[PDB]
Structure formats: structure tokens, C-alpha cells
Subunit: 332 residues, 4 copies
Amino acid sequence: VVKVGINGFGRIGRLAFRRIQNVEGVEVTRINDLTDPNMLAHLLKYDTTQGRFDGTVEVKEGGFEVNGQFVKVSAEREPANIDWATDGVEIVLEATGFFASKEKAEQHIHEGAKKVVITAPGGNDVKTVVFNTNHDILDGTETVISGASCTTNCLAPMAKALQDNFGVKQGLMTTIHAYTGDQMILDGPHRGGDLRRARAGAANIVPNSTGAAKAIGLVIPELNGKLDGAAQRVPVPTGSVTELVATLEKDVTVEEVNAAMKAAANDSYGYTEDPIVSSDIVGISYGSLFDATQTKVQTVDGNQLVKVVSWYDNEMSYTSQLVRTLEYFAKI
Amino acid sequence: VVKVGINGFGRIGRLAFRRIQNVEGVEVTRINDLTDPNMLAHLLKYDTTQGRFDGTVEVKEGGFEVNGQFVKVSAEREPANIDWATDGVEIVLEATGFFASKEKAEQHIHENGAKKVVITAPGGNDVKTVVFNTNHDILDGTETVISGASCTTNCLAPMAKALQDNFGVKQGLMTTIHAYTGDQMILDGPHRGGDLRRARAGAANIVPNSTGAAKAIGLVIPELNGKLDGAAQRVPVPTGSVTELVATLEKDVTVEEVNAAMKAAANDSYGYTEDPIVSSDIVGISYGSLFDATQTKVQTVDGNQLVKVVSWYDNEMSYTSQLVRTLEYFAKI
Amino acid sequence: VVKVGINGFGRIGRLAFRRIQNVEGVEVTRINDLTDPNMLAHLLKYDTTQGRFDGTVEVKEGGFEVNGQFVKVSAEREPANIDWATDGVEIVLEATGFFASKEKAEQHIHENGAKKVVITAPGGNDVKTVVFNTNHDILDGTETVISGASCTTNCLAPMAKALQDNFGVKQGLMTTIHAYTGDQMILDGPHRGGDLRRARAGAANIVPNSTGAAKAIGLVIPELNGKLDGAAQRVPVPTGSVTELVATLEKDVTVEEVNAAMKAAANDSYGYTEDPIVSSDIVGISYGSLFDATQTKVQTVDGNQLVKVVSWYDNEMSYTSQLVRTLEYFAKIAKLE
Amino acid sequence: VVKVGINGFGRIGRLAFRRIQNVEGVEVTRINDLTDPNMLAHLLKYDTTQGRFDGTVEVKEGGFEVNGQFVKVSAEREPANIDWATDGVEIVLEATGFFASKEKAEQHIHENGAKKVVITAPGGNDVKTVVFNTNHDILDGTETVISGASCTTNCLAPMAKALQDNFGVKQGLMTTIHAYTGDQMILDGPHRGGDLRRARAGAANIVPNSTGAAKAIGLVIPELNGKLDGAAQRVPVPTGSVTELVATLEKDVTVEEVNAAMKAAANDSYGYTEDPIVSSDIVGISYGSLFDATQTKVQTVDGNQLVKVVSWYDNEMSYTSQLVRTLEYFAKI
């Protein structure tokens, strides 16, 4: 029974919680967010995209009581004074976004938590892990690691599969992504200065930058600098799809490509041949779901351009990955 | 030429600036906002619901150059620190929503600056609230700070008044199927105001919500004071709203009389149709309120009646048009 | 077990089918629809609003295999040519919309056919309209064809009923902030029914629309006959709706009084809540109506009162849940004509 | 001067009509549609995505009176029964989608018929495809029936030809993040064409969908025949689209070089922009395609380059604008 502690109860934090209620070896014994508990309890009970909470949530003095089981809920501002140990928390899921550094993160470790999985990007100190793609790089001596981004978790299994089977020369990625909470609901000043995220998110197709373009080299070394992309935010509250147009070190057919993805299938990387749409991936556990129906292999004058597509619930897919990385990193 | 100053370049502020461009005799010579001029310029040029700006917008030293005309853009945190006079501003449109009291608003008014102020919100105790063409005749010219009511009040006012002048209103409940607003979360998250419903994804839910238009209609129509109440259902539409009013009248009526009466009350602020229009059809209109005769109802049961009247409005542009009419009028009084 | 047959595999038929998988004494053994089987199987496995099918669906020779069970799927144009008996179907759910009359509906009831039919269309003359847990007591079992009312009525009835039984209703006006439906155009175009409002883009407008719920509510609650009337405002939500009733009562009341009464009338078809929920929170619910105590208003002005009560409902699964609950009951109270 | 007749008053037809009201020397004198005139008149006046009609529309005996001018509105099912010649119709905009072939579209050519036809869909074998400002120079003026291509083709063409004429195109793959259209279901249900993806709620999903603009780009830009292939992702926006093209070129290039080439190729049909716009900012434009320099990508990995260019476009109005540009030229040619 791996005891988890969540710091930051946003979309990712709350979904992390939910997902853990369905994973056997793991369970949350301590939550720490700055928001008013009644507010957090309501948001956990009612979710627009992920649906009602599977169970019951009742506010109590120390925290909540989820399905006849008390869960401590604190509102500590600094990792320093979060006595995770009192509740038996051995791993901490840092998802507030204010501790994206090796230093900030380590604060959770005193005696005190033992290991921390960061949601934000790593840097020199932190290793970036996309479960079932490169969690093998973890030896056990790590204290802080990153679960990478939602987009990386979708692109990795797919790109790795292209690399391992045919070898990738280079490629460009385009993600038709759902709008996120950092976009304006209506045209207004985006405190980040982004002239595009300042526009109404659910009323526009909004071009936007991506980090999974380069960061992909931190998960799949042989691809370092080989891939680049962008995104197109669209009016869907959750659910995304990644398109990778690549050039390979070997010629292929649609069937070969599709086959290789099926061969690479597991709990984190699924496979379909059903003509599905966005809504069909809301809430899945796969961090990425290859769509064989969208595969393309254009041949013109002996040269090929390969197109492979993968769907992913930018919310639950990403969360399922975080939860899998947690349970593993904790058992190391 | 009525010189206007805009404090707060948000949705209202920007649309107010836009409307003024098609109102001869009124010009905006200064905008005060804390946001980077470049961000503001961009938002004035490109608008999702109201369209591309009609003309040119350039960021120049000290402000903007819109259609060959210069507009100073300042970023003062304190109203008293805005020298509206140096730019010839005689009347300020308080559109930040941060100031809703006679005291706070009067700061604009001094010698280094403003002469008159129109706040875009319920203005407090010592402030008259005006819905153009409904009660602006109460302005004697001496007042310093006035209120232009709210977007919902401007829709409700002319409609309710027509019911009062023709039949007498005993009491009534109102429901506004309102477009979502910047006040709501784009995706489920902690709402800074603590509102558990505004905390929900605004463009993906029917969201029940309180309002005070019907409750403070007495500030516009004294005879209705305390006679009306309501709420709203926010829906996945970026702009455009409808206000339904169910009430009890003193005289018995027919669907025909209520509609005829509304039509007679029609003017530049209160429109009238019989076309089965829909919400997008009112986006950007100039009427502060548009009565819809196709949705009228007069239910008679055992001698007693319930009358249902409906009016459309662009919670953004309808309101804005009303604010400009009042600015111009108040300024010239 | 009540063996049900579905005729019309649209939103209603498919959801009735999913709901039945969670109801023990009922199962579907025959589906009849003019659509290519593969298309239907796909729409059953995947659903934009009600989610992924709970289990497995495969196209097989002559029908589907759903959760390890075979279900025959035919495409008979005429009810007369559907051997419902062959599959053990005792009760049929007529949801195609093309057999909304008693005479037309009875075509399912032949020798090698079904015994009882429940239409999803409105009823009226020789067809009783039934809103389970509100007026299913009007069924004696001898009836051949009955109606399960409309999505709107199954929401309104339990609420209006409580107001009547406890305080007495004089009159009232209803407005439903309703999700857009399949009869609306996805983009502005000629609506085949000639309706100028349903001709407009359903997911990009607040669209006024007329309902008959309030008018024919008397068919379900005789006392309220002619006492109610209403309409709707279709809004940009693929599913999930809310009904607001505004009425005058026989006696004075308080918010607590009204809410408490609604809570007292709560059961499986009529839930009660006090949480400031929102539209997406009732998508997929099995309640036929969910009273929201946070929206109640009792306005008292100069001695007179206007009472406002609001109930949420998934215009799809709530209605679907009520039909299944009516199918099962009608099937077992069933007496051979 | 040029009198146009419209057959099929759906989205394309009604927009062409509107667009022509703002085009000098072109007037619509005859409309033919099977739909009831009152429903058509209503759809012309009110439009969710393109806004209220610029003027007045009134139903009259045998037609409409638009902005004071009468227009004949008939409902003949067979093209042979439309006496276009009576109204002075010299050219016909065939948009019913039921005569997308030379011999069929030709049924419009007779005594009381027209002299030329422009179909709004891939025309067939003996029909030329035309994207104004990129290849209308192939019109000799003696053709009877021609095609204005598709909405995506009018977007992809100029951009694609700019790359060909400037650097030489090897191959490329297109992806259009497209607005949902009339052929998608508003809610999940059986799609008439058997398409399992178009059967899904188009205003509530990202919907992968096949296209043909890339595979048939050769009918407009010969050198590119068979070098391009694509697909689309329909998203929840009522109108407004953007085309992404990833290709390999004959020459090495830089971002600046590509953008500059695009700017140099700009004109009335092909726009250029460096502002970080969004889809709604594109609704209603007259460009057949608008290149966005802010989205250009030129990736260089070990000496090999992958170029990505992007163009916005209103799948409705951009394409409509192209159609009337072509209609006018063809008629005068």
C-alpha cells in the first residue's frame, strides 16, 4: 500500500486523487491546497468533463471523508511545514506549479516525505519520466523527478515506436488541443502577455506554442533535436489529438506502421482501429491512444512522409501516467 | 463636441470606445488602464464577438492613434491621479467596475481633471441610476456622478415600465437566459469569489446565477420598487441574452394588447419585432432592449392572469449603446 | 425477466438499451431499425454525451453480441413483419416516431408478435400518458398501448404534483432552459418542418422553442388540466436541461416549506438536492427529475405570492430511465387483452 | 452589368448573393431554390455566423424586394425549366450540388437559359477547376461550365503555388483544422452517407475527416499533381478555418525567406498577416486565403528541411468571395 500525498488540488491534483481510488497499490493519505475545503470538496464531487465523483465526499474538521475513509486536508503554504510523515506519506505529488525546481521540491523531504514527483519540467537536477517509455532510467537514488507534460506523454510512446522500428530522421508535430484553464473565457488581458491566450478560448481555434517539441529528447535521447511542433487550441473542454508528420530512415507501408504501434501497445499506450472522435477519449487510462485509421504514408519520387496520430485525454491520460509513475518511483 | 475619458478598457470600455466612433459629437480623448498598451491595442483591433475594429489602431508614444486621431493612454492606479483636463476630458466613463460609490467616483472630479462621471454599475446611495429613454428625464444637469445601471436593468427597464404605464404591475419574477461572462471560470477551478457555480466551466454548462436587476429596478422605476425579483441561467453563448418576465397586472389583458402596448413604447432604446429571431441575431445591436412579440403569453385561469413578456439584448453592445446615449445627454445637460 | 424489444435505435432507443443493462429484471432481445447494423453498433459503443459503452459490442451474423449476449437486430419497415415473439419479446418500445397512434402502435401486437407497446411519442385519445412514480397508478394492465410522456413532462410532473398535493396550484408558467436536440439544424439552413427557429444553428444560439409539456400535463395530473402552460429556450449544451416553474398557490408558503415538501416527495424518479450543481452534473442521471432546493423562490409582495421551483433533468438519460421503469412495470402488471 | 442567376440558395448561394450586394457591376436577378420563399427570406435576413443582412429583405409576390430591388425567386426542379434569359441572367451560379457535371450544369444553357455556368464543387472531367488569382488565366472565355473548386482548395492553392514558384515542391501533407459543417450531425446519430465520424455531434467533438483538396490540387496547379495529400480535423467552431501544410522543398529556406515570398505573392485573393490572430478574426473576410507569418516553421535536422506554412480562411465567406470573383471574370471574359 503506497501512501501518497498531494500538494496542489487543481485539475491535475483532483484527477490524480480520483485515479488513485481505482489503483490498488496506491492511496492518498494527505492533501494540501491553499483553497477553502468546502470549495475543494465541491469541485471533487462535481466535475464538468470527468463526471460526478465515484463515491461520496463530506467535509470534516481535519479534511474530507471519502467513501467512509477520512483524508487529511491541510492548507500549508510551504513544503517545510507539511508533516506528510504524520499521515505516512512516502511520495509527494507536487502539482501547484510553484515548486518546479530541484530545490523547491526537495523541501517536502524532511523527517517529512521521502520522494517527490513534480508535474512541471525537470531541468538539470530532475529526470523526466513518461511511464512505460523511459521509467527504466530510474535507479532508486532519485528524490525528485518529473512526470513530464500531458503532450509529451502522448507523443513519447508513438515517437519511440517509430524510432525503435524504422528510425526517425526528423518530424513536425501539431496537436489539436482542448482549451485549458490558462486561456481567457472571453477576450481580455492575459496576465502572461499572450495575445492569443487572451482571446475567448471556447469560441476560437487558437494557435499556441508547445514544449513537447524539444523536451521529447529528455525522454527519448535518440530523438533529441529531431522533433518540433505547435498546437491548435479548439472549443472542446478536454480531449486532444497529436499529429506527427515524420521522415524515416527506412521506407514503410501503412500496415507496417500500424502494426508496430499495435506491437508497442500496453497499459500506457493503447491501440484502436475504430473511427473514434474526441469525446471517446475523455477519461481513458492510456497516456496515449494510437489511431490506425489516421495513419498516412505518402510516397512521391521514392521519398516518404509518414503521418501517425494519437488521441489522449489531456486531463485523465496525463493523470493516469502520473499515478503510474508515482507507484513505481515510490517502490524503488 | 463632448470630450470623453474612459477609465477601464475592459469589454465595456472598449465597446464604449467603439460605439463613440459612430456617434458624431462625441470623442474619447483619453483611456486610463493598467494593462500594457500593446495588449489593449490588440484587443481593440480584434474582437471575437463584436468583430474586427472598424478602422486603424496603432500604438504610439503616450497612447493610440485610431483612425487618424490620437488618444492618450495612461496607467494611473488612482483616479485622483488622472488629469483628465489636460486632455480636455469633461466627462468620465467609470468602466473598471472597481468604483461604485459617489465618494470613490468623485475622485475623478476635481480641477486637475474630470467634470462629470458616469459609472457603469449600481452607483451607491447618493447616485441616480439612468437607463436612457426610460428615466433619463430625471437628470437636472447639476449632478456630478450618475449610474448607467446594468446590462440587465437596461433590458428590463423599458419592458417593465411599459407594463406599468399601460396596465399597472402588482409583482413579478424574472429569469434571464444570459450569455456567459468573464466572471466565470473557463474550466472547473477555485473561483476567487467563492461562488460554487461560477467556479464551473462557463462555456460547457447551464449555470444558475443570482442577479440584482429586478431587485433594484425601483431605482429606475420607483413604482416597481420591491415588486420584482429574479435570477439567471448562464449558457454557452459568448454574448446575447434574453430576459423573461412573468408578472401579475392590475388590468386583465390579452396577448394582443401587451404586444400593441410594447410596440407603442418602441423608440431608439427599446426595439420591437415579430420575427422569430434567435440570440446571434441581436449580437451588436444598438437597442438597449428588443421586445419579442412571438414569445408573449397571457394565461387566464379562473379569472386570474399571468403575463409573460420577453426581451432580447446583447449584454455587451446593447448596454454599451445605452451608456453612450447617457454620456452624451448627461454631458450636454 | 421482462424481455423488451426496441423499435428505433436513435438517441432514445440506444440509451434505453444501455439503461436496461443496469436493471436486473429487464433485458432487450430484439432491436429493429432501418439503419445499417455496423453504423448502429458504432453509435452504441461510442456516445458523445453518455460516454463509452459499459462493456463490449460486436457486430455478429443477424445482430450484435453485447456483453456476451446475442441480440437480434432486424430492419423491418413495417411492425406487422416483426416476429417479436420469436425472441421472447413481451413488451415493445416504439421510438421510431412513425407509429405514434394507438392503431399504428398496435401493429406490433399480432400473433407472432408482442403483447404490449410503449410509445415515446405523446399519447391522448385511446392512449394513456404515464410518468412513472407520478401516475403509473392509472394503469390496470389491460391497456394495449401507452405513452411514457415526453422528456419535459417526466421532469415537470413530479414537481408540479408535489405543489398540488401539498398546497394546491392555481396556475403557473414554465420555462425550460433546454439542451439543443436532433431536430435543430447544426448550421443555418431550411428546417424541413418549416420552423424558422429550429432552422438556426443549435449549438451557437439561445433558441426559443415551443413545448407541449405544460399544456398536456393534465393528461398526467387531471387536477392541473389547463392550469399550466410554458415554453423553452434551447441552449448550447449537447444534453442536460433545467425546468423552472412559476406559480400561484391555494395557500401561503415559505422557502423551507416548499423545499421540505419536495424532499418529502423524493423517490427514485424524483431526486432532491441542495448542492449548487450545474448542468453537466445531471448528465447520465437515472432520476426522472432532480429538484434543486437552491433555486426556490417565494416572492411575497403586498400579500400575494409567486412561487418558483426548479428541477434539473438529463433530457436523455432521465427520460430514458423513466421509460425503462415504465416498460418493466407495464410488462409485469400486464394482463392479456 | 453582369447579371447572375443562383440555383440553390443554401449557405454558398445565400452568401454569394450577400457578397454581390457589395460588388459593383454584378447583380443577382434570379434565384431558384426548392425551399419555401419565406424560409429563404428569413435565412437571408438572419445569419448566425455571417450576421444580419446589410439592409432590408421583404417577401413579395414571386420573389423578394432586397434594398428596394425586386429579385425573382422560383422553385423549378429541373434546370431546363428555369428561364434565366427572362431576367437577363447571363451566368449561373450552380450550388445545389445536384448538377456537378458538365452535361448536367449545361441544362442551364438554352434559349431562356444562361450562356455560362460556374459550379461550386469539383466539376467533372470536361470541366475546368478555377481558383481566382492563381490559375483563372486558363479561361479562354469559350468554356460553358467551370468549377470554382472547394473551400479548402481556394485556401491551399495560393499558398501552395507560392512555395512551388519560389522554391519548388517535392511533396507535402496538409491538415486543416476546419469548422464543423452542415453534413455533420448536430447530435450523435445515423449519418446518411454512412460516415461513422460525421455521425457524431459536430459541435462537441474534434472529428477526423477525409478531404480531397490536396489530392486534386493538380487540377489547379499542374506541377503539384499527386505531390500533396491531406485530411482534416473538424472542431467546434460554426465557421472559420486554418490550413497547415508540411512539405519538403527543392531549395533550403529560412522562415523569413518563406514569409517574404508569401508577402510578395499577396493580392486580393491571398492575404498576408503578421498579427497573432485567431479564427473568429477571420470570419467574413474577402480573401480566398490569408497567410499567417506567425505560424511559419522551417526545421533543419542534419541538413534536411521540413517547411510548415499556414493560412486562415472562412470556409464560407472566403470561398464565396472567390466564387464571385470568378463569376465576374468568366462572364466578362
